[PDB]
Amino acid sequence: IVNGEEAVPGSWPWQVSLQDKTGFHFCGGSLINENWVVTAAHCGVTTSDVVVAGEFDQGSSSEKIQKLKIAKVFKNSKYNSLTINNDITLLKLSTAASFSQTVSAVCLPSASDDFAAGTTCVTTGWGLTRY
Amino acid sequence: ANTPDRLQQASLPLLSNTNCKKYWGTKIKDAMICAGASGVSSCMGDSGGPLVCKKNGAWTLVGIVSWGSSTCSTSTPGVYARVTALVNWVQQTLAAN
């Protein structure tokens, strides 16, 4: 994120980091329950990537971080490579996350819901801090 | 050219497709919602993360970091998948597996 502040450790407990076997982080994700993560389609997760919940400082080794595995990657059939539409993908956890006080879950809106423009929402992640 | 160590956060507003379209024009689609141009910008490594909004005191998933300016410009809108539009799909899948 560019121009963001650093978070208060554990305050966005649903946020996971998706990483490759060699540890490299390529996309964020968010927990919707003990077994499912919602990430973006174009992230291109596979059953060989690992979901990592509980982390805040990716530099610190000493952290109660759960390092889960992917059972099934569900790419949304309607996602578009070219228009980037319907860019969503669910990940079925091979092994459920233990919800702690640093590993909580986010709430899905209702298809019926309407978030008015101007509403101050928040976004999080470990992406570049400057291009 | 390296990502942050500690997790980051930023507060930004939602835009009206209309207003977002003032920038992206027709590249904006139905299952897309915009937020930003407020001086903060999602950037490389953030995709598939969340844009959450406080609904009934509860943080709700409103979008997934998707795309935007190619240099993470903080003056243009960031475009996220619109969860309210995909939520149906989310449920059919959860409910089937």
């Binding site: 450790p9 305050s11 407990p13 879950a105 | 005191g57 509860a58």
Partner: peptide, 11 residues
């Protein structure tokens, strides 16, 4: 869901 244990800040 949506209620974290440690409250987030400046949000």
């Amino acid at each position: 869901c949506g209620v974290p244990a440690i409250q987030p800040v400046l949000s």
